[PDB]
Motif scaffolding. Structure first.
Motif, mmCIF file in Angstrom:
data_model
loop_
_atom_site.group_PDB
_atom_site.id
_atom_site.type_symbol
_atom_site.label_atom_id
_atom_site.label_comp_id
_atom_site.label_asym_id
_atom_site.label_seq_id
_atom_site.Cartn_x
_atom_site.Cartn_y
_atom_site.Cartn_z
ATOM 1 N N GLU A 181 -5.964 4.920 11.976
ATOM 2 C CA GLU A 181 -7.258 5.005 11.311
ATOM 3 C C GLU A 181 -7.769 6.439 11.275
ATOM 4 O O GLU A 181 -8.241 6.911 10.234
ATOM 5 C CB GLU A 181 -8.264 4.093 12.016
ATOM 6 C CG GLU A 181 -9.709 4.317 11.606
ATOM 7 C CD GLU A 181 -10.026 3.754 10.237
ATOM 8 O OE1 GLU A 181 -9.146 3.108 9.634
ATOM 9 O OE2 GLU A 181 -11.162 3.955 9.758
ATOM 10 N N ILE A 187 -5.724 8.490 8.730
ATOM 11 C CA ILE A 187 -6.033 8.163 7.342
ATOM 12 C C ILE A 187 -7.402 8.712 6.953
ATOM 13 O O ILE A 187 -7.584 9.233 5.846
ATOM 14 C CB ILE A 187 -5.925 6.643 7.112
ATOM 15 C CG1 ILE A 187 -4.454 6.227 7.095
ATOM 16 C CG2 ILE A 187 -6.571 6.246 5.800
ATOM 17 C CD1 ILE A 187 -4.211 4.801 7.510
ATOM 18 N N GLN A 188 -8.380 8.630 7.861
ATOM 19 C CA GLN A 188 -9.688 9.215 7.579
ATOM 20 C C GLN A 188 -9.595 10.730 7.416
ATOM 21 O O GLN A 188 -10.247 11.304 6.537
ATOM 22 C CB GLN A 188 -10.686 8.851 8.679
ATOM 23 C CG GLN A 188 -10.964 7.363 8.811
ATOM 24 C CD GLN A 188 -12.090 6.886 7.917
ATOM 25 O OE1 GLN A 188 -12.602 7.636 7.089
ATOM 26 N NE2 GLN A 188 -12.480 5.631 8.079
ATOM 27 N N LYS A 207 -6.953 12.432 6.383
ATOM 28 C CA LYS A 207 -6.306 12.689 5.100
ATOM 29 C C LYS A 207 -7.277 12.497 3.941
ATOM 30 O O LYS A 207 -7.305 13.300 3.002
ATOM 31 C CB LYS A 207 -5.091 11.778 4.935
ATOM 32 C CG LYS A 207 -4.223 12.110 3.737
ATOM 33 C CD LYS A 207 -3.036 11.171 3.636
ATOM 34 C CE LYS A 207 -2.243 11.426 2.370
ATOM 35 N NZ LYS A 207 -1.121 10.468 2.211
ATOM 36 N N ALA A 208 -8.088 11.435 3.993
ATOM 37 C CA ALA A 208 -9.062 11.198 2.933
ATOM 38 C C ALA A 208 -10.107 12.307 2.882
ATOM 39 O O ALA A 208 -10.494 12.753 1.797
ATOM 40 C CB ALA A 208 -9.729 9.838 3.131
ATOM 41 N N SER A 260 -11.581 14.542 -3.638
ATOM 42 C CA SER A 260 -11.328 13.952 -4.945
ATOM 43 C C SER A 260 -10.494 14.887 -5.812
ATOM 44 O O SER A 260 -10.747 15.053 -7.005
ATOM 45 C CB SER A 260 -12.639 13.600 -5.644
ATOM 46 O OG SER A 260 -13.335 14.768 -6.043
ATOM 47 N N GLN A 301 -7.816 16.170 -8.209
ATOM 48 C CA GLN A 301 -7.061 15.576 -9.303
ATOM 49 C C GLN A 301 -5.979 16.547 -9.753
ATOM 50 O O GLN A 301 -6.266 17.716 -10.032
ATOM 51 C CB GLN A 301 -7.974 15.219 -10.475
ATOM 52 C CG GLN A 301 -7.243 14.657 -11.683
ATOM 53 C CD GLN A 301 -7.842 15.125 -12.993
ATOM 54 O OE1 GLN A 301 -7.863 16.320 -13.288
ATOM 55 N NE2 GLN A 301 -8.333 14.184 -13.789
ATOM 56 N N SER A 302 -4.776 16.003 -9.850
ATOM 57 C CA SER A 302 -3.644 16.800 -10.249
ATOM 58 C C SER A 302 -3.549 17.035 -11.722
ATOM 59 O O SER A 302 -3.743 16.133 -12.527
ATOM 60 C CB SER A 302 -2.358 16.105 -9.804
ATOM 61 O OG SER A 302 -2.425 14.708 -10.034
ATOM 62 N N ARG A 303 -3.272 18.263 -12.070
ATOM 63 C CA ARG A 303 -3.042 18.628 -13.461
ATOM 64 C C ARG A 303 -1.547 18.818 -13.672
ATOM 65 O O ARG A 303 -0.904 19.570 -12.933
ATOM 66 C CB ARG A 303 -3.802 19.902 -13.837
ATOM 67 C CG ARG A 303 -4.746 19.725 -15.009
ATOM 68 C CD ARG A 303 -5.170 21.059 -15.597
ATOM 69 N NE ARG A 303 -5.905 20.889 -16.844
ATOM 70 C CZ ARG A 303 -5.378 21.031 -18.053
ATOM 71 N NH1 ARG A 303 -4.104 21.350 -18.217
ATOM 72 N NH2 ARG A 303 -6.147 20.847 -19.121
ATOM 73 N N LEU A 304 -0.908 18.131 -14.688
ATOM 74 C CA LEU A 304 0.521 18.203 -14.951
ATOM 75 C C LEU A 304 0.940 19.528 -15.573
ATOM 76 O O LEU A 304 2.104 19.916 -15.448
ATOM 77 C CB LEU A 304 0.936 17.046 -15.866
ATOM 78 C CG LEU A 304 2.429 16.789 -16.062
ATOM 79 C CD1 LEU A 304 3.068 16.375 -14.749
ATOM 80 C CD2 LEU A 304 2.644 15.725 -17.119
ATOM 81 N N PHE A 305 0.020 20.233 -16.227
ATOM 82 C CA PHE A 305 0.360 21.439 -16.964
ATOM 83 C C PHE A 305 -0.636 22.545 -16.657
ATOM 84 O O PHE A 305 -1.802 22.288 -16.353
ATOM 85 C CB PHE A 305 0.375 21.191 -18.479
ATOM 86 C CG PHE A 305 1.485 20.297 -18.935
ATOM 87 C CD1 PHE A 305 2.782 20.770 -19.011
ATOM 88 C CD2 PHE A 305 1.233 18.984 -19.291
ATOM 89 C CE1 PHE A 305 3.805 19.953 -19.429
ATOM 90 C CE2 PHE A 305 2.253 18.162 -19.711
ATOM 91 C CZ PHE A 305 3.541 18.646 -19.782
#
Lengths: 53, 53
Positions: A1, A4-5, A7-8, A13, A15-19
């Motif tokens: 627990e 995981i906390q 890591k969160a 938040s 967000q991955s960008r592919l390019f």
């Protein structure tokens, strides 16, 4: 627990960008037009349809 | 009787939880959109419907 906390909390938040920015830089087209001493200007060959009056 | 009373006193009203925090952290969707030097901004490709006046 706890792991995981942690890591969160660390990831939040994200967000991955592919390019990234595309490496193709040129957007215009190459100017293949000739340029002779007969040209009225560097950008116009003649003034054919022009009427003085 | 003494052992059962001791167990009841020690456990108190503890309630078991079946789950902790879920390990799946990412909630957003990956950004797969391209990004070229023709884009007006990093988030907008163009301003097509925009009228100046």
């Amino acid at each position: 627990e706890a792991h995981i906390q942690m890591k969160a909390a660390a990831l939040k938040s994200a967000q991955s960008r592919l390019f990234g920015l595309d490496g193709g830089i040129s957007t215009q087209e190459e100017n293949t037009e000739r340029h002779t001493t007969e040209d009225v200007s560097p950008s116009m060959h003649t003034l054919l349809g022009v009427k003085n009056m």
